[PDB]
Design a protein around this ligand. Structure first.
Ligand SMILES: Nc1nc2c(ncn2[C@@H]2O[C@H](COP(=O)(O)OP(=O)(O)OP(=O)(O)O)[C@@H](O)[C@H]2O)c(=O)[nH]1
Ligand SMILES: Nc1ncnc2c1ncn2[C@@H]1O[C@H](COP(=O)(O)OP(=O)(O)CP(=O)(O)O)[C@@H](O)[C@H]1O
Ligand SMILES: Nc1nc2c(ncn2[C@@H]2O[C@H](COP(=O)(O)OP(=O)(O)O)[C@@H](O)[C@H]2O)c(=O)[nH]1
Ligand SMILES: COc1ccc(NC(=O)CN)cc1
Ligand SMILES: [Ca+2]
Ligand SMILES: [Ca+2]
Ligand SMILES: [Ca+2]
Ligand SMILES: [Mg+2]
Ligand SMILES: [Mg+2]
Ligand SMILES: [Mg+2]
Lengths: 54, 352, 438, 428
């Protein structure tokens, strides 16, 4: 039950008690995801419009 | 109208409780995967406790205490008794036991050999028994070499404990036996002891000069009904109940089952369950737990009671299923979900 | 002095963000118009509160915050609310139609079209910082914006601010205050793509805040207002070290050091006490031992789980009020002998303690009672994995039938991303089991 | 400013649409001349969802009235709130549709559709952020059924990413005008299954049986049947028309009610439904019991014959919201077999402080239940009974239609039935 690194200031204090010792995607890659999904939405809508045009 | 689910089809006890619940016309059984339930008769292994108590508008209750395995595992119980100050290492009612890991894998190998050598040098009875939870595989021997080589041949954890060389023998027969007590702990953590126990007797005369024939040393109902040749001679099914066992203790020993044995049993049950209460109690939890336990005891020739093991998913004596199961519904289920005596239990009061 | 920028995404983040800055102002003595009499350095300064507030030449203290929602009705309450004077208009960003509780819609469809605008506004705040620490991102798991647009923002923040730390405050979905059937989908999708970008995330289960509000505050049917005022109390306890003089958790880097030894297991459990009802006749003030013992009662945890059956990797005790180190250690010693506190072997069995003498501030007319001392315990337990298990289970139920999946695929997401995100959660659950189970 | 554009087509469509605008206009404080005379700000909070604001603080419904004969819309323009509609939004012909789907969809309807679309486009171009469209129509006639589904097809082509909602009256031989109603309904269901995001199925027999057996109206009329639809339409749009802790967005509603794209056909319900003992207060338990009772539902489908995929309940009035949650959870937990277990928490509940006219409180029910398949089974049976002999087919082949088109429509509706039955037997 040891207290270490005790700090005291006007607005409080802090310390540490030790009871026992121990034993990314680039900017380009993000644009490709976003544009890939956008292209899939445009393709799905184009199929809908091709269906409605038929 | 209360609802419950069943997730252990192999449970004889709760199959009856499930049969009684539906018999009250006020409980409805759901599919095992339906989450809107009041009661769960859960599986024995990997019961998903984390998914309980998260359905709005439902008080949920389960028939298992998360953490009771610490008491119902062979190796876990040994570690719990040696490490829990409430029980201490000098506990008088538990045989000197050691946890031994097979060499193909802390481990108390050297600590066991120290006490073994001590007994061998002191002319004392030095017979031990090796067993594991993965057994139906038990070995009784008086040589430390054999016990250790038997564990290395396996691949799971084992435990070696002192074999009671002076067990109490019933007459006629000169035969060993063990006592089984059923204990029900409800959500409030009241410890109830079923007034009815069973003695699983060995239909073979005890022989301390031949631990090879494990039929007169292991009182299991399976070994006695498979490898024993006097099964069903003295008592039906090698099962003697308290009434007969008590009258025997009076005619032969001039004592009663309450004084000579039962006080010690009640003491052991209290000590074991009160010890783990902080670790498994569902008092301030989002769900509630209850559980039935099977305590197995040994008695020696000094009328001293020893704790053998604690079973978390025990079966019941065929002749006692009705009374006990109904007892589970009365104090365990209906106490939380009331329906629209002279209790069969013995409340072991304590300090919560 | 180093600055922290707060980002509030979606309805949950915005309303919670609003409740936090209301509390910060009362804590630092900042009026709604932005003026601060106690600040003697007019139009500047490098004080502890300046990590969250910039200053104008006219003495206005302006939050270092950005509010983003894909629909304008929630942020309009900020534009016309009590603290409408704190934020300048550029700080409040709104679209015209939301993500419809659809992760793919907030991440791909709508996120692609507003991401570069959000970054530009964040860049404007960053350019006011002489030493930016990082970001605090508030959002919900279930919302389409909170889940979908946040994960996109987190990706871009790691690109534009590589050396900056990022803490989350995430609202875990609870059926008692949720009308979205697909929130388990959104929660897992956003956790998957955000995991490698968050250095420390504080999950708040709405189910827990709901029950605390009903059990302790006698609120029959709590609202978002009741929930947010309590959530902002906890948030204030957690961020106080950055806004006040002290030596514990003084920068965002310290949150990771003191709470996350394993990078993937960065979800500390928060426990707060005491929560006393203001309508009460008058409460008996709890001692350091009683409030500290309460930190080990599941009923005061931000996520309902059982730490008795996990293993601790770290533990921070953050006290606010009349507390001295002597009483803390005396209460802890009493608790170690009475509680089940199992630490992992590769970590020390210790407690870092922070005490700020200023007792918790309570919003006048709110529900919380003024207490003399309170504590917020931050512990990294494997037991919080129960929350992931619950969430994963609901995910599996719907995904086995592909229920609702067409809505996501219809916004340009591939079905494979569902199982890719699910397999990540399965790994996350394996790591917890390898750390806290024998 | 999430605007909805309303369209009502045919006789049934315009008579029910008329009463709908009558009911909600009263709720929002709009009088017959479009002037607001309410007393609460909540009435104008979301008024722009269904109304446009003109000069002089007037409010004009965003509604387009369509028919191939003048008669019905003449009545509307001369009705109670007839003056409230934009005169330019009346688009009608003179030939009629002869209760003939082919005439509304291909011949007579085709001649008039472009002028209707010009009115739709004009209403949209003044929308700050158009949510989507809602159409009221019958499926048993020619204009509402045939031209209505043609309008939906063309609306979807021009606004492919907007939500399309309909209130659809399904025919019943017990409440019938002509024998060809099964033909018209089956052809329309084929369109709806493909093009609408949400369809409230209103069965004229359920409306009849409620008026007769519950309301105790000896000889129900179409006007009596429409009182129920008006009230039901006011309930399901309460989320959209008033503020509250609910978002209520057409797209958000669809995401939470439609687990599979083809299974977007709902059973609506309303409570109370009291006969004239009409002044008694109704408790939250009573509201919840009735709202879930089959007799209070309007698809003529017993929910006990299927399972709920999703459910949305809206409570209106000043009531114990705690008591509401309790009663809703009680109904689920006490009948959990009727809710699919592979969609957790599939029952959502909303509340609104403003009750309908003359009611302390009420509850509207929206159920996406696999039991709706029995409705399509009825239509499919009546259809095949005639089609197997090609009876009455000449009215349709005379308009350029081929038998093959009938066969395809039938197969799609039967497929739809097969889907409901497969999710009704599904398990975790
Ligand atoms: N605690 C708390 N939770 C909230 C609040 N607002 C919303 N939530 C939760 O957030 C989840 C819904 O996500 P939202 O944040 O509302 O959705 P969103 O982020 O705005 O994204 P959209 O779908 O586009 O609206 C639900 O689980 C709500 O319970 C709030 O003010 N406080
Ligand atoms: N230390 C010991 N001394 C004497 N007998 C012992 C003993 N350990 C075990 N036994 C004998 O073994 C039997 C119990 O075996 P144990 O309970 O360890 O195996 P098990 O758990 O697979 C059977 P069950 O769970 O049904 O009781 C008792 O009848 C007892 O006679
Ligand atoms: N509920 C209701 N149903 C109607 C009404 N008028 C007609 N119907 C039903 O609608 C079908 C006839 O369609 P109708 O609207 O008259 O044809 P249309 O004018 O060509 O669109 C039949 O099934 C009628 O039972 C009405 O006012 N109310
Ligand atoms: C309410 O309007 C009605 C219209 C038709 C009927 N009857 C038939 O359809 C012929 N059985 C009854 C009522
Ligand atoms: Ca200053
Ligand atoms: Ca990073
Ligand atoms: Ca013509
Ligand atoms: Mg055993
Ligand atoms: Mg939103
Ligand atoms: Mg007609």
């Amino acid at each position: 039950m040891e207290v270490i690194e005790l700090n005291k200031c006007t607005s409080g204090q802090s310390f540490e008690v030790i009871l026992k010792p121990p034993s990314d995607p680039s900017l380009e890659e993000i644009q490709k995801k976003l544009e890939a999904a956008e292209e899939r939405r445009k393709y799905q809508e184009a199929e809908l419009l091709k269906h409605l045009a038929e | 109208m209360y609802t419950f689910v069943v997730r252990d089809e192999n449970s004889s006890v709760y199959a009856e409780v499930s049969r009684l619940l539906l018999a009250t016309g006020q409980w409805k059984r759901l599919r095992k995967d339906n989450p809107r339930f009041n009661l769960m008769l859960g599986e024995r292994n990997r019961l998903p406790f984390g998914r309980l108590g998260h359905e709005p508008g439902l008080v949920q209750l389960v028939n298992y205490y998360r953490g009771a395995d610490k008491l119902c595992r062979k190796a876990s119980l040994v570690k719990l008794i040696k490490t829990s100050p409430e029980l201490s290492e000098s506990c008088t009612w538990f045989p000197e036991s050691y946890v031994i890991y097979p060499t193909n894998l802390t481990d108390e190998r050297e600590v066991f050999l120290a006490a073994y050598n001590r007994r061998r040098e002191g002319r004392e009875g030095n017979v031990w028994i090796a067993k594991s939870s993965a057994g139906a595989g038990i070995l009784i021997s008086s040589e430390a070499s054999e016990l250790l080589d038997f564990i290395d041949e396996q691949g799971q954890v084992h435990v070696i404990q002192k074999y009671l060389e002076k067990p109490l023998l019933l007459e006629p027969g000169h035969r060993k036996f063990d006592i089984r007590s059923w204990v029900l702990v409800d959500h409030l953590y009241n410890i109830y002891l079923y007034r009815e126990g069973v003695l699983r007797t060995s239909s073979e005369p005890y022989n301390s000069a031949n631990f090879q024939d494990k039929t007169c040393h292991l009182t299991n109902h399976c070994i006695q009904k498979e490898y024993s040749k006097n099964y069903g001679r003295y008592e039906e099914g090698n099962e003697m109940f308290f009434e007969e066992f008590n009258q025997y203790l009076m005619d032969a020993l001039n004592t009663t089952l309450e004084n000579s044995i039962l006080l010690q049993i009640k003491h052991i049950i209290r000590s074991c369950l009160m010890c783990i209460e902080p670790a498994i109690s569902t008092k301030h939890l989002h769900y509630q737990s209850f559980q039935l336990f099977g305590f197995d005891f040994m008695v020696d020739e000094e009328l001293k009671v020893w704790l053998i093991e604690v079973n978390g998913a025990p079966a019941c004596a065929q002749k006692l299923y009705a009374e006990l199961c109904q007892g589970i519904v009365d104090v365990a289920i209906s106490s939380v979900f009331p329906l629209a005596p002279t209790s069969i239990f013995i409340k072991l009061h304590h300090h919560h | 002095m180093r600055e922290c920028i707060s980002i509030h995404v979606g309805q949950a983040g915005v309303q919670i963000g609003n409740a936090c800055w209301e509390l910060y102002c009362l804590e630092h003595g900042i009026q709604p118009d932005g003026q601060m009499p106690s600040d003697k350095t007019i139009g500047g300064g490098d004080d502890s509160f300046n990590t969250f507030f910039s200053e104008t030449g006219a003495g206005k203290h302006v939050p270092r915050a950005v509010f983003v929602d894909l629909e304008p009705t929630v942020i309009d309450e900020v534009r016309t609310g009590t603290y409408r004077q704190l934020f300048h208009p550029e700080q409040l960003i709104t679209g015209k139609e939301d993500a419809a509780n659809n992760y793919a819609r907030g991440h791909y469809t709508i996120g692609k079209e507003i991401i570069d605008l959000v970054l530009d506004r964040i860049r404007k705040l960053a350019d006011q910082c002489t030493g930016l620490q990082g970001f605090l991102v508030f959002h919900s798991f279930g919302g389409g914006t909170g889940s979908g647009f946040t994960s996109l923002l987190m990706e871009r923040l790691s690109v534009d601010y590589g050396k900056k730390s990022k803490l989350e405050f995430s609202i875990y979905p609870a059926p008692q205050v949720s009308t979205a059937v697909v929130e388990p989908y959104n929660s897992i999708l956003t956790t998957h793509t955000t995991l490698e970008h968050s250095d420390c995330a504080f999950m708040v289960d709405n189910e827990a805040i709901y029950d605390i509000c009903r059990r302790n505050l006698d609120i029959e049917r709590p609202t978002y207002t009741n929930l947010n005022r309590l959530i902002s109390q906890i948030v204030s306890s957690i961020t106080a070290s950055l806004r006040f003089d002290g030596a514990l958790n003084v920068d965002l880097t310290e949150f990771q050091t003191n709470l996350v030894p394993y990078p993937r297991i960065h979800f500390p459990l928060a426990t707060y006490a005491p929560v006393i009802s203001a309508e009460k006749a008058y409460h008996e003030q709890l001692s350091v031992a009683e409030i500290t013992n309460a930190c080990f009662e599941p009923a005061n945890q931000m996520v309902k789980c059982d730490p008795r059956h996990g293993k601790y990797m770290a533990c921070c005790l953050l006290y606010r009020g009349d507390v001295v180190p002597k009483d803390v250690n005396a209460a802890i010693a009493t608790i170690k002998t009475k509680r089940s506190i199992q630490f992992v072997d590769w970590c020390p069995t210790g407690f870092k303690v922070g005490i700020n003498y200023q007792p918790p501030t309570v919003v006048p007319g709110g529900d919380l009672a003024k207490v003399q001392r309170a504590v917020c315990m931050l512990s990294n337990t494997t037991a919080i994995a129960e929350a992931w298990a619950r969430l994963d289970h609901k995910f599996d139920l719907m995904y086995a039938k592909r229920a609702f999946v067409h809505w996501y695929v219809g916004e340009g997401m591939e079905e494979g991303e569902f199982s890719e995100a699910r397999e990540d959660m399965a790994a996350l659950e394996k790591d917890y089991e390898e750390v806290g189970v024998d | 400013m999430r605007e909805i554009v309303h369209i009502q087509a045919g006789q049934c469509g315009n008579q029910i649409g008329a009463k709908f605008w009558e009911v909600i206009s009263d709720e929002h404080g709009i009088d017959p001349t479009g002037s607001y005379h309410g007393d609460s700000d909540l009435q104008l909070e979301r008024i722009n969802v269904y109304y446009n604001e003109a000069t002089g603080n007037k409010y004009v419904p965003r509604a387009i009235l369509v028919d191939l004969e003048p008669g019905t819309m003449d009545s509307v323009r001369s009705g109670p709130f007839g003056q409230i509609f934009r005169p330019d939004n009346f688009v009608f012909g003179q030939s009629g549709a002869g209760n003939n789907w082919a005439k509304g969809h291909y011949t007579e309807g085709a001649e008039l559709v472009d002028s209707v679309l010009d009115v739709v486009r004009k209403e949209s171009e003044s929308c700050d952020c158009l949510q989507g469209f809602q159409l009221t129509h019958s499926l048993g006639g020619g204009t509402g059924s045939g031209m209505g589904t043609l309008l939906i097809s063309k609306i979807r082509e021009e606004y492919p990413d907007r939500i399309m909602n309909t209130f659809s009256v399904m025919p019943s031989p017990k409440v019938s005008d002509t024998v060809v109603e099964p033909y018209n309904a089956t052809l329309s269901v084929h369109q709806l299954v493909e093009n609408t995001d949400e369809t409230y199925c209103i069965d004229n027999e359920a409306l009849y049986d409620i008026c007769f057996r519950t309301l105790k109206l000896t000889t129900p009329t179409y006007g009596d049947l429409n009182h129920l639809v008006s009230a039901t339409m006011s309930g399901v749009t309460t989320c959209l028309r008033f503020p509250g802790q609910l978002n209520a967005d057409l797209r958000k509603l669809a995401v939470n009610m439609v687990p599979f794209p083809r299974l977007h056909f709902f059973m609506p319900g309303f409570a109370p439904l009291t006969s004239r003992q009409q002044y008694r207060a109704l408790t939250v338990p009573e509201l919840t019991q009735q709202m879930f009772d089959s007799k209070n539902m309007m698809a003529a489908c017993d929910p006990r014959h299927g399972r709920y995929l999703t459910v949305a309940a809206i409570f209106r009035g000043r009531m114990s919201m705690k008591e509401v949650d309790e009663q809703m959870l009680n109904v689920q937990n006490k009948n959990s077999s009727y809710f699919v277990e592979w969609i957790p928490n599939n029952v959502k509940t909303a509340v609104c402080d403003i009750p309908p006219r003359g009611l302390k409180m009420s509850a509207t029910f929206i159920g996406n239940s696999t039991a709706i398949q029995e409705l399509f089974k009825r239509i499919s049976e009546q259809f095949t009974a005639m089609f197997r002999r090609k009876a009455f087919l000449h009215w349709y082949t005379g308009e350029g239609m081929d038998e093959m088109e009938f066969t395809e429509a039938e197969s799609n509706m039967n497929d739809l039935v097969s889907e409901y039955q497969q999710y009704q037997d599904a398990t975790a």
